[PDB]
Amino acid sequence: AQNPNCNIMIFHPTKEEFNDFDKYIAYMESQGAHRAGLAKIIPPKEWKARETYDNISEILIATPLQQVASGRAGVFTQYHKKKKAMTVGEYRHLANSKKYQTPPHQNFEDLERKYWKNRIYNSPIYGADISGSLFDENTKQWNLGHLGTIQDLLEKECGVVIEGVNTPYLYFGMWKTTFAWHTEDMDLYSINYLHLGEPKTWYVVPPEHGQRLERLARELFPGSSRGCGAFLRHKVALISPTVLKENGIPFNRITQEAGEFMVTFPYGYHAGFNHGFNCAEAINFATPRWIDYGKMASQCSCGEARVTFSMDAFVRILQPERYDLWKRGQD
Ligand SMILES: O=C(O)CNC(=O)C(=O)O
Ligand SMILES: [Mg+2]
Ligand code: NI
Ligand SMILES: [Zn+2]
């Protein structure tokens, strides 16, 4: 069995290997990459996402979110407070302000220490889930707006034709902006490209060990767990690496820098934080190997998780028994 310790693998495809996206995912899996839950892909030196980032300041962040924490430094939740609209240029100036900018630090490890010590005492502002793309239309390789769609994958594998669409989303981050522990909707894959700016640190639990993380989370967030049998779908809970180590949870960590892709694999729990002002693009995708995970994915039906239109079909076709309850949670 390849990669039996479930380490995060880093790939360096050639320009020729960069042509066929599906083939390369399947290659990474042949080498055991999925066992980690996360892989990094460094694009060939000849590749670029677009020519420059000099003209992005007028993108609008219609609903910036202030991430307010509650709990203790290593075990906390966050809620998202809506803020007034602002442009990317206004958000960048805010991220760089004395109140929000990255502190002086020695290296990524020092900054990680500072994040986990001090995150809860601040409320950074995040642009999230902004439909759109920064890939040039002429970029043919690994263009996250030109991927094969999940609806087409389901039709190819299963024969069933369904409604829905699959488009990318932009994220604008600053120091301490945080992504809570989660798997993707319907335990899909994700791909994330860091277009510009400062790094993103990721933590990940191997898919084969995800239920260990879920059991710890039920222990650490006991009221949330009573409220919902899939409360990690709410995407609000944080647990530090120190707490995961104290509790014996298998995990790995890696830092993504600008110009790098990350792929998350089905049922790979992940969480992390941004180092400073940045812009990322991400989208969910499927392969044939996903189908079995989609059929088994947990679902939130308490009303909190509320998700896209296109997840309806996935539940309806893959999880007909759960469909009525889950749709009630949507309405
Ligand atoms: O850009 C981001 O914060 C969030 N990304 C993820 O959790 C992902 O791509 O799967
Ligand atoms: Mg612009
Ligand atoms: Ni994710
Ligand atoms: Zn719920």
From Swiss-Prot:
Residues 136-302 form the JmjC domain. It comes from the Eukaryota. Fe cation binds at residues 182, 184, 270. Zn(2+) binds at residues 228, 234, 300, 302. It is found in: Nucleus. It is an enzyme of class 1 (oxidoreductase). Ubiquitinated via 'Lys-63'-linked ubiquitin chains. Deubiquitinated by USP14 with the help of TRIM14 leading to stabilization. Its EC number is 1.14.11.66. GO terms for cellular component: blood microparticle; chromatin; nucleoplasm; nucleus; pericentric heterochromatin; site of double-strand break. Binds 1 Fe(2+) ion per subunit. The modification PolyADP-ribosyl glutamic acid is found at residues 16-17. It catalyses: N(6),N(6),N(6)-trimethyl-L-lysyl(9)-[histone H3] + 2 2-oxoglutarate + 2 O2 = N(6)-methyl-L-lysyl(9)-[histone H3] + 2 formaldehyde + 2 succinate + 2 CO2. Keywords: ADP-ribosylation, Chromatin regulator, Dioxygenase, Iron, Metal-binding, Nucleus, Oxidoreductase, Transcription, Transcription regulation, Ubl conjugation, Zinc. One of its GO terms (biological process) is chromatin remodeling. Its main location: nucleus. Its cofactor is Fe(2+). Residues 8-50 form the JmjN domain. 2-oxoglutarate binds at residues 126, 192, 200, 235. Histone demethylase that specifically demethylates 'Lys-9' of histone H3, thereby playing a central role in histone code. Does not demethylate histone H3 'Lys-4', H3 'Lys-27', H3 'Lys-36' nor H4 'Lys-20'. Demethylates both di- and trimethylated H3 'Lys-9' residue, while it has no activity on monomethylated residues. Demethylation of Lys residue generates formaldehyde and succinate. Belongs to the JHDM3 histone demethylase family. This is Lysine-specific demethylase 4D. The gene is KDM4D. The chain holds residues 11 to 341 of 523 of the full protein.
